[PDB]
Amino acid sequence: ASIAQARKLVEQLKMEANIDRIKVSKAAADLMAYCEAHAKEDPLLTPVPASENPFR
Amino acid sequence: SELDQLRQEAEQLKNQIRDARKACADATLSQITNNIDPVGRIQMRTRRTLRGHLAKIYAMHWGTDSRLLVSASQDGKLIIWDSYTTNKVHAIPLRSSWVMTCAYAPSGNYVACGGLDNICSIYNLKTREGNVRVSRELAGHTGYLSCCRFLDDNQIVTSSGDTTCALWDIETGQQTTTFTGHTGDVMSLSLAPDTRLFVSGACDASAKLWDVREGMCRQTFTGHESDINAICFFPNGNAFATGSDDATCRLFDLRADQELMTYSHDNIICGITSVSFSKSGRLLLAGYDDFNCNVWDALKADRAGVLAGHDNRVSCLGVTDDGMAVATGSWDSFLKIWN
Amino acid sequence: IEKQLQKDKQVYRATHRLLLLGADNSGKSTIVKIFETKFQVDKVNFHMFDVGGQRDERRKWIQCFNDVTAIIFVVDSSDYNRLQEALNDFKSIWNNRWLRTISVILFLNKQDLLAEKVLAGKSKIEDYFPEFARYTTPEDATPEPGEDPRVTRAKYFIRDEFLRISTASGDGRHYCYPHFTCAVDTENARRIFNDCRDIIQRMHLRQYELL
Amino acid sequence: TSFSILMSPFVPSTIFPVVKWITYVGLGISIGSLILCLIIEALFWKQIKKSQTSHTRRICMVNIALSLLIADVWFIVGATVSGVCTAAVFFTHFFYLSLFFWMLMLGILLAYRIILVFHHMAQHLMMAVGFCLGYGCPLIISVITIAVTQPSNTYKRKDVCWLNWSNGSKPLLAFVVPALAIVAVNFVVVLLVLTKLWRPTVGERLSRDDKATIIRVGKSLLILTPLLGLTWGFGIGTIVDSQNLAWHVIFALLNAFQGFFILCFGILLDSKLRQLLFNK
Amino acid sequence: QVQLQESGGGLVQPGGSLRLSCAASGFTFSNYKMNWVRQAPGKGLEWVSDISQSGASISYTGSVKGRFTISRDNAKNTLYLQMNSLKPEDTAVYYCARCPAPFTRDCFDVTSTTYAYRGQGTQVTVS
Ligand SMILES: [C][C][C][C][C][C][C][C][C][C][C][C][C][C][C]C(=O)O[C][C]([O])[C]OP([O])(=O)O[C][C]N([C])([C])[C]
């Protein structure tokens, strides 16, 4: 019923609060580190010879 | 007044959770990534135009070998494509004309489809006879199947329109674990690279993070304000980008558990249908209802390219595992390969 | 493999897809005579879908029917309480962004039941719709033979009220075809065929921009 | 030089320079109009939607436009200029018939899409018959005429090099009668379109009196007249008398301005093309 | 997060005046068409009135035509509904609903018990 679904939301919210959150500055750096580390192997980001490309 | 007290407690919990996000919300990814140089303008051309679909291609999926492409169209035909040579490897007729999702197994032996029939039908592509048949029929969802992904050969996870997600075993044919908690129609889900956990976006303007083994909602992200239609993880697996009908794409971090960056532009008034990440994750590609796609920078939130040439709404798009090329499928019954 | 697709191409284009949506009390199954139905009239196949296996959230799966020839809207005039709800449903379908290029064929199903309701006098339309008192029967409207004048005015007011939303928006891209249907009627298939034929004719004229 | 000699055996001596001057200015704007039309069609060839009906009318538009350009320029050079004059007769006569037969295809396609809406036959085969009869039949008529009347020397007008109307030979009406036949079939096609559009369709009512129906009808009538060659219908008015100044001037004015009419009505009034042009 | 809060309500004598206020947060109020829906006891939800993005297009249901006055306040993201000449049939729980798609005049807020964009609402009782 209405009271039943509201009870589940409360339990989910308590669990969500208990998770430790890492600082955004450290988290943002990890995403940037991955982009620069894998930048060369990415074919769309960097120019690729037509010989290597099988679509051309 | 028991119900009223419970609602007040939930509201207080949301404020406490929101304060927790703001406690660690110092600095922004845009501020940090200002020093690096822009990627610059990206020029993309249609290397291959895949023709043969009778009706609109609502969903598509790439292969693990970056060669085989599978697309689902409303004409009732499921076609496996040879992207390199532009040939139809297989053509699978569908019992139900309305299909909304299609998945390609990592091994490549199995292909799945689902739609308004409330059934996720799976076909075997490596049968001895060579003719495609329904390997196994999955039933149990009370809503339309919106997205399905193959965790492995024997396990498949599906998102349906009944606000629930389920994990199905091929041999058993029944749902082993049901993911419940969404208050809106679940439209898309993405699989993490390690397949340990996945996140599903629903029509409730929220993305919930789920773990396959435990079957519990680990995290919930509420940053959008309209129906969510596109979910895709970062290649690192610690973040994901979400596009919604409010013409905005938002990137969320699993560890930070908050919104990182928003990819929006004033002239855009069209919602998002499909999003994808490149090999490195720096390049973000999102589908739009303005008959074309836009290429975004994951670290600067600026437009880098436009994928025009589509005569209808871009229903779906995908990038190969190796990042060799990106394929875009719109409602004009045409699949275009971009490089 | 291309030969099989070519054969399926002719079948796909020859058949015409129709979407059947409406209220549960509107009697959608009566219009025809799992949920999928097929009927062929005048040597052309008409293929109709009735989506009832989903939930009430219809803003997402309705986009799958943007390629259908027409939308068959079935509404019941015997219930004035739910008549406003059907009008809101028609307005949402008419003003939908993905359904703006699809014509709608409107069926006033079970018009026979409406006759006794208006003749009895216990239920008055003016209570729910204040505009009914000032409404007058149009000159172009043709009263049904052997019918009370109040019956004709009551049934045409509902048809006109549905058409106000039709004329409000659309810019001529899609048109609404209202029809009156009784409890039993064998001309429903013929009426659908005539409107669908009309829709195709107007589509070509708009494509040529003559319209 | 009068441009009325195509549909009139004789032109009045006093009226001839007046209509000729109208002809020269009319070709000046038309030739420039046709050049713009070809550029627009070529640039927007891939921009149009991939529809069976949309593509076949577009190829009819360019073929009519292409035929009009070549026929007009070869008509001017023949008037200015013995071998080169009489050589241009075959091509000018063939191109104009090609324009007439291509206009028939637009009319037939318009009638076929209305009379038979469920006859979704093969587009490629239908394209072939349009090219086959649009150009082959005018070619057949042109070669037969030269085969019979050229040795008789009746194929050549005195310093005009156009089909004549005199003596035992009948070259002129051999060209005129097909042209009037196309207009007669195209006028019937136009009347069929008016039959569908005459009934109001704005919620089964006009809602704005007869003005709403007329303005919708009027827009269709302007588009249909140059594309299907309804302006050539005035030729029968001037061919019966061949001495009426009023009949001669209107025939030359509209036909010379047909190229302007095609660009202004067939291109600018194209709703899909105007927005596409704005984007470019 | 999208959250809609309704203020006001309560017991009202017939023929009185009520001004319900709907608080909008988590989204741009100016970009979405807004609706008011009531759920009578033992009856499904029904649409009452709607307001366009700029307020140019405002329509009401037949039961409150002229009686009800509605408006939107884009300055502080608030939606106002004025109710006059109360009747016993008007006794219902009024919800503040928002159409999902921005820049659109079409929405399906009539959905019952499954809608994340509808507020909790307030109970209105007419004596
Ligand atoms: C590209 C270029 C453009 C153009 C092209 C071409 C088109 C045309 C052809 C087709 C043809 C048509 C017809 C159909 C078939 C049949 O046979 O069927 C019978 C009927 O006939 C019967 O009907 P009726 O009545 O006869 O009608 C007649 C009319 N129309 C016009 C159709 C001839």
Residue numbers in the entry:
A (entry chain C): 7 to 62
B (entry chain B): 2 to 340
C (entry chain A): 26 to 58, 207 to 254, 265 to 394
D (entry chain R): 567 to 647, 654 to 852
E (entry chain N): 1 to 127
Mind quoting what the paper says about this structure?
Adhesion G protein-coupled receptors (aGPCRs) are essential for a variety of physiological processes such as immune responses, organ development, cellular communication, proliferation and homeostasis. A defining feature of the aGPCR family is that most of the members are autoproteolytically cleaved at a highly conserved GPCR proteolysis site (GPS) in the GAIN domain, which has been suggested to be critical for the maturation and function of these receptors. The cleavage results in two noncovalently associated fragments: an N-terminal fragment (NTF), which includes most of the extracellular domain; and a C-terminal fragment (CTF), which contains a small part of the proteolysed GAIN domain and the transmembrane domain (TMD). To uncover molecular details that govern the tethered agonism of the aGPCRs, we determined the structures of ADGRD1 and ADGRF1 in complex with different heterotrimeric G proteins.
The structures of ADGRF1–miniGs and ADGRF1–miniGi1 provide molecular details of an aGPCR in the recognition of different G protein classes. Similar to what has been observed for the class B1 glucagon receptor GCGR26, Gαs and Gαi share a common binding cavity on the intracellular surface of ADGRF1. The only structural deviation occurs in ICL3 and the intracellular region of helixVI. To allow accommodation of the bulkier C terminus of Gαs, the intracellular tip of helix VI moves outwards by 3 Å (measured at the Cα of T7856.34b) in the miniGs-bound structure, which is accompanied by a slight shift of the C terminus of the Gαs α5-helix towards helix VI. In association with a longer αG–α4 loop in Gαs, which causes a steric hindrance, the receptor ICL3 adopts an upward compact structure in the ADGRF1–miniGs complex but exhibits an extended conformation in the miniGi1-bound structure, which results in different patterns of receptor–Gα interaction in this region. Alternatively, the cryo-EM maps of all three G protein-bound ADGRF1 structures display strong densities for a lipid molecule bound to the intracellular region of the receptor. Using ADGRD1 as a control, we discovered that two lysophosphatidylcholine (LPC) molecules—LPC 16:0 and LPC 16:1—bound specifically to ADGRF1, and that other classes of phospholipids did not. It stretches from the membrane lipid bilayer to the intracellular tip of helix II, with its fatty acyl chain penetrating into a ‘tunnel’ shaped by ICL2 and helices III and IV, forming extensive hydrophobic contacts with the receptor. The LPC molecule serves as an anchor of the receptor intracellular region, stabilizing the conformations of ICL2 and the intracellular ends of helices II and III, which are functionally important and have extensive interactions with the G protein. Furthermore, a marked impairment of receptor constitutive activation was also observed for the G7024.45bY mutant, which is expected to form a severe clash with the terminus of the fatty acyl chain to repel the lipid binding.
